[PDB]
Amino acid sequence: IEIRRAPVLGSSMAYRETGAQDAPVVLFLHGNPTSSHIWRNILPLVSPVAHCIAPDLIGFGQSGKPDIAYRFFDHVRYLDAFIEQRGVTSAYLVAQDWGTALAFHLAARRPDFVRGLAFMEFIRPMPTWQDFHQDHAEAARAVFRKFRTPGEGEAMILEANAFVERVLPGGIVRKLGDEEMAPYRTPFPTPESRRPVLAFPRELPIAGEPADVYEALQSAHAALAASSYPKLLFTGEPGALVSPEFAERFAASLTRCALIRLGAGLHYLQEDHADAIGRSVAGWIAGIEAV
Amino acid sequence: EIEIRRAPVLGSSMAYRETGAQDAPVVLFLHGNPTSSHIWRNILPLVSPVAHCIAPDLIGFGQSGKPDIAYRFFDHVRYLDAFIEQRGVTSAYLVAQDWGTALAFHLAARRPDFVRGLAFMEFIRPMPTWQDFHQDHAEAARAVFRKFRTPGEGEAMILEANAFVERVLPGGIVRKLGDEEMAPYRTPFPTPESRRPVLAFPRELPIAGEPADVYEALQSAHAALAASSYPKLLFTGEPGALVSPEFAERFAASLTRCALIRLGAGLHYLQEDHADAIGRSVAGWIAGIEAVR
Ligand SMILES: OC[C@H]1O[C@@](CO)(O[C@H]2O[C@H](CO)[C@@H](O)[C@H](O)[C@H]2O)[C@@H](O)[C@@H]1O
Ligand SMILES: OC[C@H]1O[C@@](CO)(O[C@H]2O[C@H](CO)[C@@H](O)[C@H](O)[C@H]2O)[C@@H](O)[C@@H]1O
Numbered sequence A: 001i002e003i004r005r006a007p008v009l010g011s012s013m014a015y016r017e018t019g020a021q022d023a024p025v026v027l028f029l030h031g032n033p034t035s036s037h038i039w040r041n042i043l044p045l046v047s048p049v050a051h052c053i054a055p056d057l058i059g060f061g062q063s064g065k066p067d068i069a070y071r072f073f074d075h076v077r078y079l080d081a082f083i084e085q086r087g088v089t090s091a092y093l094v095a096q097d098w099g100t101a102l103a104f105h106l107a108a109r110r111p112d113f114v115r116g117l118a119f120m121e122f123i124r125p126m127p128t129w130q131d132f133h134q135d136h137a138e139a140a141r142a143v144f145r146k147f148r149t150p151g152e153g154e155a156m157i158l159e160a161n162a163f164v165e166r167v168l169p170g171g172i173v174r175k176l177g178d179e180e181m182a183p184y185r186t187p188f189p190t191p192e193s194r195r196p197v198l199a200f201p202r203e204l205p206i207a208g209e210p211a212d213v214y215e216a217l218q219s220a221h222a223a224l225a226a227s228s229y230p231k232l233l234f235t236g237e238p239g240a241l242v243s244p245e246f247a248e249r250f251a252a253s254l255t256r257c258a259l260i261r262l263g264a265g266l267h268y269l270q271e272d273h274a275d276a277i278g279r280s281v282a283g284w285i286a287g288i289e290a291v
Numbered sequence B: 001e002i003e004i005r006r007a008p009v010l011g012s013s014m015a016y017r018e019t020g021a022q023d024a025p026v027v028l029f030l031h032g033n034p035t036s037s038h039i040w041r042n043i044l045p046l047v048s049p050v051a052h053c054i055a056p057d058l059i060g061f062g063q064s065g066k067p068d069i070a071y072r073f074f075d076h077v078r079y080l081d082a083f084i085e086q087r088g089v090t091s092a093y094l095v096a097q098d099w100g101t102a103l104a105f106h107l108a109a110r111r112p113d114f115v116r117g118l119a120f121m122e123f124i125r126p127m128p129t130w131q132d133f134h135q136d137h138a139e140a141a142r143a144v145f146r147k148f149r150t151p152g153e154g155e156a157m158i159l160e161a162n163a164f165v166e167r168v169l170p171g172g173i174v175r176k177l178g179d180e181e182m183a184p185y186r187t188p189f190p191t192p193e194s195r196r197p198v199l200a201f202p203r204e205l206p207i208a209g210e211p212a213d214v215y216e217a218l219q220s221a222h223a224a225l226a227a228s229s230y231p232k233l234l235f236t237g238e239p240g241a242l243v244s245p246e247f248a249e250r251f252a253a254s255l256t257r258c259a260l261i262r263l264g265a266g267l268h269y270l271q272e273d274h275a276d277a278i279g280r281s282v283a284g285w286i287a288g289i290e291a292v293r
């Protein structure tokens, strides 16, 4: 699969594309601090049934690095512009981490765009720190509190590259090979290049802040609970942002939401479960399109 | 949790494995020769979160009863029909391989309203000549099955030598089964006479018009399959055995609502090499269909 590039809002976004184009479109949306790289072993399993498009968010992967704030709403604007530039009129969405917030927000604003939503390890408004990660992961809670602290977050993420070097491997059960880890590092050679990686944890909707993202994601979650398109939720054990127990309650709170149990898994489920995820998604799309 | 149970059927009994919530769609898993519901053991746990899974042992196979019958294709049809009635199943997805597919196609042709969807692989079709049985690189397989179908020779190979269990079975699996995995394939068949149903099957294969009744039934069943409107999922291995990848793409494209799922390296007993891929595929597919209805 070639990396391709699209002009977007006077910058550019890199993307991977595969599959016959007479088929329904599936948009794969990564989060922090990843790129379309994370889908690399899932795309070949979905491409036989769908036209797969996996963009790198602005400032991630091989996308352009404009001098912007990289707030959640900036990503929204770039992703919307990418979809427009690609001429995509409707799609399935497959999302993880911040990709899920983009998917939920897109579905809320354009309900007729969404053929279905496959998601995992998703972002929701979290009224307190007890709603961010699980009780066995107090240490993750403490790290993100630091990311959200002026000066401290800069030292950890911009200077020490902690999100790429510590958080990412900490959210994968297996140990990535050198050749698998390398493309996670290459987008972020410098402190300045790491700006988007610091901006994201500062956007997490926790304890009412930031108020604009908190409200947008409350609204997106209300829309999701009122939506009628098919949904497919994956969970790991014990997971990270989403426990198996929360996943069961969440899926039951929605209509037309299946829950697929992947087994031992933390945050970056794609890395531990690419085959299970790809096979599940391809079957699910095939089933929906049949009927 | 997966339970092994027994249903009374036509004066005998069939064993079956069952798992999943009772308020979910039913999925009926149908094995072929010389296997049992054992072959689905690693697939069931992956489908049970979305469906009520029922996996019977065909009459004379696995832990089912061994009544004094011919074990022809139409006998299996009768026992499977009676099992379905006994379990009070009114509609189901079918998941099938080998002779399981002939049973599924024949069921779907008679009762298409019963079929929620059909997931199948390595399936039986009418074969006008021996050239239509396996691929030309497997001449050895054709000679072996010709001998199975030959009076006297088949008895020596399958009943006395247990060749279907000991050679044909492992021969259609890419990996080597662990001893604990292979053992339950042997235990239903302790004696030559217990192997009667295993010998009966190759002699039922619809090759060159013989047997005429099965050939006719499977022609009619294949015509129905070609016209059918229910969702279908075809899995293929490379090179496969009864179904080549090239044949699979053409066959799937010919049908209405048929997705093709390529599994990679595989022979005949694809479940043993690809349980995870098959289970995950079937679960996502059922979830998708039931979401839209
Ligand atoms: O039933 C399989 C699977 O489908 C889902 C949606 O993917 O639920 C659908 O089917 C249920 C049983 O028929 C219905 O109760 C439900 O309303 C419908 O959306 C999954 O929830 C379920 O595991
Ligand atoms: O489209 C994905 C996948 O679905 C199948 C059926 O499972 O085809 C369906 O979708 C096609 C594209 O929308 C339709 O043209 C077709 O009629 C419908 O059955 C598979 O064939 C396909 O790979």
Ligand SMILES: [Cl-]
Pocket: A032, A200, A201, A202, A204
């Ligand atoms: Cl983050």
Ligand SMILES: [Cl-]
Pocket: B033, B201, B202, B203, B205
């Ligand atoms: Cl046979």
